[PDB]
C-alpha cells in the first residue's frame, strides 16, 4: 500500500557511509568518553 517517502535498504545505507567525516560536536562530552572511537 503506502510506502514511506524515504526508504533505504541495508546495502544502500552502507553505500552512503562517507569514509572522511568529522565527529559531531554533540559527542564531544566528557560523559561520552567511554563510548567514543
Amino acid at each position: 500500500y503506502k510506502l514511506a517517502d524515504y526508504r533505504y535498504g541495508r546495502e544502500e545505507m552502507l553505500a552512503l557511509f562517507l569514509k572522511d567525516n568529522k565527529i559531531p560536536s554533540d559527542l564531544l562530552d566528557k560523559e561520552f568518553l567511554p563510548i567514543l572511537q
Binding site: D5, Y6, R10, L16, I23, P24, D26, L27, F32, I35
Partner: protein, 176 residues
C-alpha cells in the same frame, strides 16, 4: 543538530541517540547505586547518522550495565512517554558477542523504513548486561496485532539470527 541538506539523503524521521549507564549495587560495586541517561544527539539524514554511529563504540564492547537507545526525535526512551505508554516492544536476548551486529542490522532497518508499519515505530534499544545482551524495538500501539505481527516478520528477515533464537513481545504496562 539535525538539518535537511540538499546534498544529503533524508531519513523519513529525525532520530536521537541516547546513552544510559547504571552502577547497579551497593554491595555489588564499591561505589553506591547510580543511574544516568544522557541524550547524545539528533540527526536527519543517512550521512548524519554515520557521523554519530561511526564514532560510537559498538555495544558488544561496552562494559557494565549500559544501554544505547535510538528513538524518533521527540520520543523519550521511557515507556511512560506519551508516544510509548500504550505501546510495547519485541525483545531478543542474545549470548555475548552477537549484539553489535544485530544492533547495526536493526537500526539500519529501522532508519531505512524497512518495517512498513506507518508511524508505529518509536525506537530501538540495545542493553548490555554481564551474561547476556538484550535488543528490542518499541512500537506505539501494543494492541495493534497486525502491526506487531509485521514487525516480528521484518525482524526475522533483517536481523540474521539462528532460527533457534526466541523473541518475546511485552506490553509496557504489563510490568505494573
Amino acid at each position: 543538530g539535525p538539518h535537511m541538506l540538499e546534498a544529503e539523503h533524508p531519513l523519513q524521521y529525525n532520530y536521537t541517540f541516547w546513552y544510559s549507564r547504571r552502577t547497579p549495587g551497593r554491595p555489588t560495586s564499591s561505589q553506591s547505586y547510580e543511574q544516568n541517561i544522557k541524550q547524545i544527539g539528533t540527526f536527519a539524514s543517512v550521512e548524519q547518522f554515520w557521523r554519530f554511529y561511526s564514532h560510537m563504540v559498538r555495544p558488544g564492547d561496552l562494559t557494565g550495565h549500559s544501554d544505547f537507545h535510538l528513538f524518533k526525535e521527540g520520543i523519550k526512551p521511557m515507556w511512560e512517554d506519551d508516544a510509548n505508554k500504550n505501546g510495547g516492544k519485541w525483545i531478543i536476548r542474545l549470548r555475548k558477542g552477537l549484539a553489535s551486529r544485530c544492533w547495526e542490522n536493526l537500526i539500519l532497518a529501522m532508519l531505512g523504513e524497512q518495517f512498513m508499519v506507518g508511524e508505529e515505530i518509536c525506537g530501538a534499544v540495545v542493553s548490555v548486561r554481564f551474561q547476556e545482551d538484550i535488543i528490542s524495538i518499541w512500537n506505539k500501539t501494543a494492541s495493534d496485532q497486525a502491526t506487531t505481527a509485521r514487525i516480528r516478520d521484518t525482524l526475522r528477515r533483517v536481523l540474521n539470527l539462528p532460527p533457534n533464537t526466541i523473541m518475546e513481545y511485552k506490553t509496557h504496562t504489563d510490568s505494573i
